[PDB]
Amino acid sequence: NKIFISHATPEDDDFTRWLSLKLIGLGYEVWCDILFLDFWSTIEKEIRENTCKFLIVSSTAGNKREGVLKELAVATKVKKHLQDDMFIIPLAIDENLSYDDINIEIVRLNAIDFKKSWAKGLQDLLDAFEKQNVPPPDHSKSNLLYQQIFLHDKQAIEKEETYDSNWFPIISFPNELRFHRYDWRLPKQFDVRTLAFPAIRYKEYLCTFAWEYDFIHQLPKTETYNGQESIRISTSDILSGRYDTDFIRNYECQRLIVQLINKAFELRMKDKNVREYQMSKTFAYWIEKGKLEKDKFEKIKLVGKQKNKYWHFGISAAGKLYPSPVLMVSSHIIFTMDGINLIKSKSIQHSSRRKQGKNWWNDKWREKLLAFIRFLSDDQNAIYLNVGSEEKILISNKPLKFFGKMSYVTPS
Amino acid sequence: AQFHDQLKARLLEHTIPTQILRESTLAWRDFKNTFGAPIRDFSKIEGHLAWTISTAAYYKAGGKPWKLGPGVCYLGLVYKKIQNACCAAQMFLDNGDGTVFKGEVGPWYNPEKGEYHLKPKEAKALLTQALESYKEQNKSYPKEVFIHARTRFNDEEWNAFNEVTPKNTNLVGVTITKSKPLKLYKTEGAFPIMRGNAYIVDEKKAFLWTLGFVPKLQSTLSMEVPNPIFIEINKGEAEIQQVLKDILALTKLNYNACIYADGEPVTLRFANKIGEILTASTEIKTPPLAFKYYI
Amino acid sequence: MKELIYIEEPSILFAHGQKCTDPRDGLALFGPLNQIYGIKSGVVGTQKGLQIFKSYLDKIQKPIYNHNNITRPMFPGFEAVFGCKWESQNIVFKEITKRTYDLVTLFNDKIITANKNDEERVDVWFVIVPE
RNA sequence: AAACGGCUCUAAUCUAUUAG
DNA sequence: TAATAGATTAGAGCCGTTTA
Ligand SMILES: [Mg+2]
């Protein structure tokens, strides 16, 4: 009481899987080679022993293979044995294959047309071996069969895996955040973003991590300043939220610290010999051509060429302190014509970025980002941000590591 | 620019399920960039293409493609710029186990230019609409109201929600933010982090990977490296794990598409769709409230 | 070195109560929940638009293959998946022969005139927008 | 506008401060 | 009113179709 489906396996896998799963759904014991995970002895034994019908797929590739042809031949031998005219039912699917060029052993057989409306063909199949007396539907059997073979090859496995993030932690912070009462030594029209070291104008003060005499070369009114006026706050209390006074609120001073971090990163990369591109909300920092050995760091290429343009891996970094003091970076691709001059129009930049990211993937992005970050490190495992003469901001070379108990097998 | 939005808006009064199909979609091969391949290359996705269209054609024709697998209404509200307009999308399960997903419409207008929040009266009106819809579809009040949005709920509007919600009903407000710069890579394989992993930063805030590598799909739902969505339980009491489970469940109901899952929860996406549809044209009294007239 | 919590994939139900993770595969094996009997397609567009819609509808009737058939399942065909007829020979066609407002209004009043006046029922109107 | 994504661009608001 | 930030938010458009 088995329905046998014979087919060209790689070509007709999809049709065979669909039809077999449906037929198991309606409640018909179906035997197929792709339904089972020598074998030929079993194939012949089931063709000869208890199969009721023998459905043969008749695609353009289903009549030119020795295997399908000779399982069809043995099926015909069985058909003559049973003294039953209703044994072999062709299932023609291919539009390019006409009712000519069909195999001689099956040409006389009344096929079931699947060329149009596969559902109509399956309906013909069902109303055919309904009154042909071929032996309660249970579609859960079809679902289980789908899960057992077509699904178990790729599913959720309890496998430990390790992930590299884009969050590069801040190793250490300057001990004291200092506000300087620069009442007249700082002109009110001066841009403190132009200062060689990060500084913010909060409450008429100069919110900065630097000492009181760093801003000297460009701001020569500031010497002879009494250091007692400046207010210094322990950065640990700021980060932990302990320091929340009427002078400054905790969120505000954390925001000032973050702005100092961002400005420090910006001016450090200004001194790190990396070119800048004005993003929508930030700055993208990338490498020109010819600035890396074979245009690569270690063994990871950061700058390359595609369709007459030069693509450059670039990074845009900001600082946040909610989960931990950490710099989050964003990976971008910046396109140039000759590698030295930036492309003026942004539509071509966006189109080329999409085209390049079409073929870039997890491993490529991760290795390029890690290569960039480690290329910004003067230390073996740290990046320096110059916020003060005696104070620096340390960014870990290795980003936050993560791990997972459940993962997937990687086919490549 | 606004052809589809205006057309869908002007069909709302006389309820007519309409699907706009571009010629460049149905027969993409004919239209060519005049120097090479067609302007839209659908060859790799033809079946998928057909899939989506068929599902859409099966949805707007009054067919239900797939359900979800109680007592909790998930309501995503999204604000559209015009004055700002808040539009909701509600989904829940009734006694018949046939998930009800229609979406609450009749956008509530905040006069403020950039206050992506609801005045107390508008918040009470929206929550009353949603709660009464639950009561009418289930003959009893819901056990929980799961509000999620792309914006954080203020104290005033959440307090209004609390006054207007009935007793023995817990309501939770979640800020679901996309494009959070946390690109979590994979160091051993060449393929991205698989879909479903979550980074619990805190008992109330976390990162969820509603998109990424799928084992069953044997590839990634997102190109390049997936961008996780930040799920923050801004208001109310709820387990972060149950919240992330609910968000992953919501990422399955995108009847507008035939895709394994989408990056953001479906309720927010459909609230955004109906919000664009409403704000396209003039005000419509008692809008149809069913997605097939907007999506 | 942080714990990453795993959230099990939620199952979306399909016909006959069977649940599958992939909507497409669940549709192919089981099919949708409610059995609408068919789609009385309505088309609002030009002659070439109607021809394009009819040709693509007939293409939908037959199976259509993705390039990579494991990462995105095949399409068994509309009747194969959904169990309802959406043939292109039962189509209700409305011929089309500030600027956004007028262009919207043309397809609009065609649709209301057909929904109000025409005897034939249309379950969903497929506005084939020209390009 | 089949759709989902990645990206790019722009704008606004809320906070804290400084100059009108 | 203007400015400098961070944090949130919203709008568009635009390319590719998810490494077998
Ligand atoms: Mg759609």
- 3-state secondary structure string, chain A? CEEEEECCHHHHHHHHHHHHHHHHHHCCCEECCCCCCCHHHHHHHHHHHCEEEEEEECCCCCCCCHHHHHHHHHHHHHHHHHCCCCCEEEEECCCCCCCCCCCHHHHCCCCEECCCCHHHHHHHHHHHHHHCCCCCCCHHHHHHHHHHHHHCCCCCECCCEEEECCEEEEEECCCEEEECCCCCCCCCCCCHHHCCCCCECCCCCCEECCCCCCCCCCCCCCCCCCCCCCEEEEHHHHHHCCCCCCCCCHHHHHHHHHHHHHHHHHHHHHCCCCEEEECCCCEEEECCCCCCHHHEECCEECEEEECCEEEEEEEEEEEECCCCCEEEEEEEEEEECCCCCECCCHHHHHHHHHHHHHCCCHHHHHHHHHHHHHHCCCCCCEEEEECCCCCEEEEECCCCEEEECCECCCCC
Tell whether the torsion through CA atoms of C76, C77, C80 and C83 is positive or negative: positive
Cβ neighbours of A164 in B, within 8 Å? 184-187
B275: phi then psi, degrees, rounded to nearest 5: -65, -45
Q: Please, is B65 exposed, middle or buried when counting C-beta atoms within 10 Å of its C-beta (0-12, 13-18, 19+)?
A: buried
Give which of A91, A125, A146, A152 to mutate to test C binding, by max C Cβ within 10 Å. Answer: A146
d(CA A160, CA B191): 15
CA dihedral A38, A42, A48, A51 (to 10 degrees): -160
Q: Is B247 helix (H, G, I), strand (E, B) or coil?
A: helix
Q: Is the dihedral of CA A21, A22, A23, A28 positive or negative?
A: positive
- Is there contact between B212 and strand E, defined as CB under 7 Å from any strand atom? no
Q: Which two tokens stand for residue A399?
A: 């980003």
Please state, as a whole number, how many other Cβ atoms lie within 10 Å of the Cβ of residue A95.
11
Report the b/e string of B265-281 with b at 16+ CB within 10 A: bbbbbbbbbbbbbbbbb
CA dihedral B102, B108, B112, B117 (to 10 degrees): -50
Which DSSP state fits C17? Answer: G
**Which of B181, B189, B196 is closest, CB to CB, to A410?**
B189
Backbone angles phi, psi at C129, to 5 degrees: -70, 125
List the one residue out of B214, B243, B211, B256 whose CA is nearest residue B229. B211
Gap from A321 CA to E1 C1', Å: 34
The position carrying tokens 């795993």 is: C6
Q: Rounded to an integer, what distance in angstroms lies between the CA atom of residue B238 and that of residue B24?
A: 46
Ligand 1 centroid to residue B257 C-alpha, Å: 7
Q: Which residues of B are annotated as a binding site for Mn(2+)?
A: 8
Q: Are strands A30-31 and A51-57 parallel, antiparallel or unpaired?
A: unpaired
Residues within 5 Å of ion ligand 1, judged at the Cβ atom: B 256
Give strand D nucleotides closer than 7 A to any protein Cβ.
1-19
Where is C64: in which H helix or E strand?
Answer: none
Does the nearest atom of strand E lie within 7 Å of C98's Cβ?
no
| DSSP code, position B43 | G
B57 touches strand D (CB under 7 A): no
Structural contact between residues B17 and B292, judged by C-beta atoms closer than 8 angstroms: yes
Give, in Å, how far the C1' of D17 lies from the CA of A178. 16
* Nearest-angstrom CA–CA distance, B102 and B88: 10
Residues 6+ apart with CB under 8 A from B151: B79, B116, B117, B175
Taking one residue from A and the other from B, the number of pairs with CB-CB distance under 8 angstroms is 97
Query: Distance between CA atoms of B189 and B55, rounded to whole angstroms?
Result: 35
For residue A139, the chain C residues in CB contact (below 8 A) are 15-18, 29-30
Task: Measure the CA–CA gap between B76 and B249, rounded to whole angstroms.
Answer: 14
Would you tell me how many other CB atoms lie within 10 Å of the CB of residue A50? Answer: 11
CA distance C90 to chain B (A): 15
Q: Which of C9, C15, C38 lies closest to C27 in space, CA to CA?
A: C15
Q: Is B215 on the interface with A (CB under 8 A)?
A: yes
| C-alpha closest to that of C77 among C88, C65, C92 | C65
Contact assessment for residue B11 and residue C111, using Cβ atoms and an 8 Å cutoff: yes
Q: Which amino acid is at A258?
A: V
Query: Which chains share 3+ C-beta pairs under 8 angstroms with A?
Result: B, C
Method: cryo-EM
Contacts 24+ apart (CB under 8 A), A283-287: A283/A316, A284/A314, A284/A315, A284/A316, A284/A332, A284/A334, A285/A314, A285/A315, A285/A316, A285/A317, A286/A312, A286/A313, A286/A314, A286/A315, A286/A332, A286/A334, A287/A312, A287/A313, A287/A314, A287/A372, A287/A375
Backbone torsions φ then ψ of B152, nearest 5 degrees: -80, 135
Protein chain B, residues 197-226, with a C-beta closer than 7 Å to any atom of nucleic acid strand D = 211, 221-226
What whole-number distance in Å separates Cα of residue B255 and Cα of residue B17? 14
Rounded to whole angstroms, the Cα distance separating B242 from B146 reads: 11
- Strand E within 7 Å of which CB atoms in B 14-73? 40-42, 44-45
Is B219 within 8 Å of B200 (Cβ atoms)?
A: no
Resolution in A: 3.1
d(CA B120, CA B104): 18
